[PDB]
């Protein structure tokens, strides 16, 4: 009865960049050393990340106990509107869990996420899924390449639902 989300990257953009995104664009991101996993928005653990054996997974490094234990209880670019911040989220993957199984976690635990490695990651704005993207590495600088994406119009509508 609980969802564990693993964010890969948070990319701060302006509305205009959001609406101009198209497949093939690569969005620069910081090499994610650590990965903070969240439950309805709230960090509950940090972890390293990889695969097992074909699924993405987290290797837990640190549980944030107080929080876990409390779960138990058409318009110019000059326009200011175009400069409004929209956070763009790349999820590494998710997993549904019971509070019990969650609390059973410890340093070292390997949690598999509900997605196959090599298949495109979910990309969201304002918590709504608006595109797919694939990790790309060139001379150790990381990026996410947009593989599929809804229309600029639908982006605009999902943002302000």
């Amino acid at each position: 009865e609980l969802e564990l989300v693993a964010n890969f990257a948070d990319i701060p953009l302006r509305l205009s960049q959001i609406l101009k995104l198209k497949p093939g664009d690569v969005l620069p991101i910081e090499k994610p050393d650590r990965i903070i996993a969240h439950v309805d928005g709230v960090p509950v653990l940090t972890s390293q990340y990889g695969t097992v054996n074909g699924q993405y997974a987290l290797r837990v490094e640190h549980l944030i106990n107080p929080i876990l234990n409390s779960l138990n209880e058409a318009m110019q670019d000059i326009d200011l509107i175009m400069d409004i911040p929209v956070k763009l989220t790349v999820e590494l993957g998710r997993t549904r869990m019971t509070i019990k199984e969650l609390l059973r976690l410890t340093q070292g635990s390997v949690v598999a996420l509900d997605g196959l490695a090599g298949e495109p990651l979910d990309i969201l704005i304002n918590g709504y899924l608006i595109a797919q993207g694939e990790v790309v590495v060139v001379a150790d600088k990381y990026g996410v390449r947009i593989t599929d994406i809804i229309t600029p119009s639908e982006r605009m509508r999902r943002l302000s639902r």
Partner: peptide
């Protein structure tokens, strides 16, 4: 078994 990425 877990192989670490990144």
């Amino acid at each position: 078994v877990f192989q670490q990425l990144g």
